[model samples]
Target: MYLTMDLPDECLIIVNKADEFDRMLYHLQQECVIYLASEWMQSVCGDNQLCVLQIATGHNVYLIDCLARESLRSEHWRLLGANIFNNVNIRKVGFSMVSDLSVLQRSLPLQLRLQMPHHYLDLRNLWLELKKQRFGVELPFGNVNRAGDALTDLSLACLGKKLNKSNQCSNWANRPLRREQILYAAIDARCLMLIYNTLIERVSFIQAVIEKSIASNNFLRRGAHV
Candidate 1:
């Protein structure tokens, strides 16, 4: 319940209501990088899967509600693919996206077919490399950057701030999501972008590493039985 780095309420947009998502079309289709994250819950159909898709650009935070409001997801999916995921111009950045992309494929009613954009990247790989050079010391969380995203560590190290993850693994599928949940989700996505800019601004040659990460073929896949 303590304070953390976060966005304003006006910036935390829930894209499920009428014309709400449609309003976001231009931003979603932009050439700039969008920091991403997916929150999961084990309630819809009594099964665990990806539920909320959060994407944060420089100006806004979009929280796309699906499982909680299944009736509203189809059009958003179409617009998402038609605009960016398939357009392959924008950089869809996320931290540790393997499970996010994998679960998305399994739960999608139709294929999302996320094309590997010209500048795709998973920030975890960058953190792993950065850990080797600077953050090699041991901490309570761990000594190494593991498979899952240790975003908290990155936040602590780079921003001199700490995120309250207490609401992170909570029940997001709740019909009317609480404000704190929205707060956590928005900040997590923005946290990715902040770290990226921190690395870009402070650590020279980080763009070089990002370019190296772009071709790693570890993020996307096309039509296959999931």
Candidate 2:
């Protein structure tokens, strides 16, 4: 039986124990891709102090508390690198993929960023492409402006719902994370997959266009070089 702890904010399946962690990994292995979102205690520590990581697959949400240990070990990073980063069969889906990966690589000692493969699909880029294709609308490029929260705005545009980020800046390093934080974190990763599934038809078509565009550009560049 799994230990279920009810917190003030939400029910969390605390998996700090080796057995629990292993069980979660077992389930992870069965999935082709997982939606991921992470909270880092950026101000509390200098950098790379990831407090919690949220992984969503189908209907399951696994919140892995990285702060359970005083500090993560090399083996820990290696395990993550081997399982999540390098696994060819498992694709990781997230928003702002580059920034998240950069944080992970800089924070951890495993050289994880370089080790990670192109298997990651950035939802933000996919969403942007979807809008440009389906709606024929243009959006601002790069890191997204906070004023518009273009990412969430784009979400509403595509998914008919807006993601609330009220607890986005909370101190994730806090123990017994608050209910609001838990809910906020859970939804952040959960919505990505939901939105992707909803727009799969359009996404697939746009992806083909993107690939063709890239191929044409590369072919022209090769000829120019020759």
Candidate 3:
């Protein structure tokens, strides 16, 4: 219902089909907050998860920039946002089946430094923290980062399967997203809520990290350990 112009540092929910939207809405309004969609991506990128990202973003991408130049006070929010994003990507979030960055770019274009290779980062280090399970517990969403992958890498793989299968890909830059794609993209946010709940329930680290993060103002000194 809320069509956003930018992807929030926070993850949102993803609904698969219009038919399911009503049901998803009910659960979200009452039970959850964030999620993502895969069914729509399946239509575009097949079931590979990563390949779908490729069709959406383009290349063997992963998390490139993990360091935030903002001060700890501001970066606290950044860490929280990055944490939510990673949790969803690795299935640690809700029951989400979608995690494609290309889809994520629907609301927010994956910001890239032009001076660099002009590629986007997947923000996997945040997830890496979850995988470490250092909060004196194991989080359901913190299942560990898939080796050699972050965001762009896996999402591309998910999307690639579909491209190979259908032998087609769209100009992601241009879109009048079909009803299916819309739902699929939203479902990703839904799933993120799921992962977040799973971790918060067990990890005191969430609060501990955020508390420490917000206490400082030096961007360089704060996120180095993250």
Expressed as tens digits, the lDDT of each residue in 116-174 for candidate 1 is: 54455777766666566554534333443432346776776666666786887788778
Per-candidate TM equals: 0.81, 0.72, 0.31
List CA RMSD, all candidates.
4.7, 8.2, 15.1
Best model per lDDT: 1
lDDT of 3 by residue, 1-226 (tens): 2222133323233222333333432333332223332322234555322212211111111111112112123333233334433332322222211233333333223331112211122224334444455432333322234333333232332222111212124322223444344434443333233334444565565755433322322222224432
Q: Sort all candidates by TM-score, best to worst.
A: 1, 2, 3
The alpha-carbon deviation from the true structure for residue 63 of candidate 3, after best TM-score superposition, in angstroms, is: 24
TM-score, predicted candidate 2 vs. hidden true structure: 0.72
Instruction: Tell me how far the alpha carbon of residue 60 in candidate 3 is from the true structure, in angstroms, after superposition.
Output: 32
For candidate 3, the per-residue lDDT at 46 reads 50
Off by over 4 Å in 1: 1-5, 43-46, 68-73, 114-118, 131-149, 220-226
Candidate with the larger TM-score of 2 and 3: 2
C-alpha positional error of residue 189 in candidate 1 after TM-score superposition, expressed in Å: 0.6
lDDT per model vs. reference: 0.69, 0.60, 0.30
lDDT score, residue 117, model 1? 47
**Model 2 stretches astray by more than 4 angstroms:** 1-12, 70-73, 109-116, 131-149, 201-226
Flag regions of model 3 displaced more than 4 Å: 1-125, 131-137, 145-169, 173-175, 212-226
